[PDB]
Curated annotation (Swiss-Prot):
<comment type="function">
    <text>Energy-transfer acceptor. Its role is to transduce the blue chemiluminescence of the protein aequorin into green fluorescent light by energy transfer. Fluoresces in vivo upon receiving energy from the Ca(2+)-activated photoprotein aequorin.</text>
</comment>
<dbReference type="InterPro" id="IPR000786">
    <property type="entry name" value="Green_fluorescent_prot"/>
</dbReference>
<dbReference type="InterPro" id="IPR009017">
    <property type="entry name" value="GFP"/>
</dbReference>
<keyword id="KW-0157">Chromophore</keyword>
<comment type="similarity">
    <text>Belongs to the GFP family.</text>
</comment>
<dbReference type="GO" id="GO:0008218">
    <property type="term" value="P:bioluminescence"/>
</dbReference>
<dbReference type="GO" id="GO:0006091">
    <property type="term" value="P:generation of precursor metabolites and energy"/>
</dbReference>
<dbReference type="InterPro" id="IPR011584">
    <property type="entry name" value="GFP-related"/>
</dbReference>
<protein>
    <recommendedName>
        <fullName>Green fluorescent protein</fullName>
    </recommendedName>
</protein>
<comment type="subunit">
    <text>Monomer.</text>
</comment>
<keyword id="KW-0455">Luminescence</keyword>
<keyword id="KW-0599">Photoprotein</keyword>
<dbReference type="Pfam" id="PF01353">
    <property type="entry name" value="GFP"/>
</dbReference>
Length: 225
């Protein structure tokens, strides 16, 4: 990785998302730091447009794989850091089971010493009586492993994963993710063998914060090779 080195220590992070869900327009600013040496992420997101039209947890996967910890033996698989500083593109479609789907485009990259994640979010065909438009998911998240594969034609990566949000009534709400990554430069990247990223995330609330917002603590480690 010619970007391996950019992550060697504590990185400032910055996240900006602009959203639209069923005409339900919004904005979130996030900021924290990442210490890729420990596959560790620390962040705080604020709804700058007042309250969130959806559920925080629904935005978690959208809200930084370059911060992942690839064990040494797997370094030759780090696409993420391979893209930097240049950066990469992340696009997604999130089909919420029995509900609407989100579409996402992001540009992840460096701005000086800050790692920036800029996102455009558009969700459609959501139900006002939904779990989503209805806000019935619990404020939590479960651990999970994602199946990473190389997308050569595209000089990038292709990923597919399921996410299960809990419904307050004790049920489960599926969010089928589908995803592509492509480098932002015409620069050389690291095409990986299939492996995975194992995640763990913990959401919280800021006792002092008075605004709509999310505290998230995640851990991500490469595995499978």
């Amino acid at each position: 990785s010619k970007g391996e080195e950019l992550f060697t220590g504590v990185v400032p992070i910055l996240v900006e998302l602009d959203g639209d869900v069923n005409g339900h327009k919004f904005s979130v600013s996030g900021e924290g730091e990442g210490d890729a040496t420990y596959g560790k992420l620390t962040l705080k997101f604020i709804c700058t447009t007042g309250k969130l039209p959806v559920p925080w947890p629904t935005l978690v996967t959208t809200f930084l794989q370059c911060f992942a910890r690839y064990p040494d033996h797997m370094k030759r698989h780090d696409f993420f850091k391979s893209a930097m500083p240049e950066g990469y593109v992340q696009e997604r479609t999130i089909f919420f089971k029995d509900d609407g789907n989100y579409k996402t485009r992001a540009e992840v990259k460096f701005e000086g010493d800050t790692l920036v994640n800029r996102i455009e979010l558009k969700g459609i065909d959501f139900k006002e009586d939904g779990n989503i438009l209805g806000h019935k998911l619990e404020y939590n998240y479960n651990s999970q492993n994602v199946y990473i594969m190389a997308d050569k034609q595209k000089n990038g990566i292709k990923v597919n994963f399921k996410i299960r949000h809990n419904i307050e009534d004790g049920s489960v709400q599926l969010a089928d993710h589908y995803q592509q990554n492509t480098p932002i430069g015409d620069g050389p990247v690291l095409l990986p063998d299939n492996h995975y990223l194992s995640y763990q995330s913990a959401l919280s609330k800021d006792p002092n914060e008075k605004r709509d917002h999310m505290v998230l603590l995640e851990f991500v480690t490469a595995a499978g090779i």
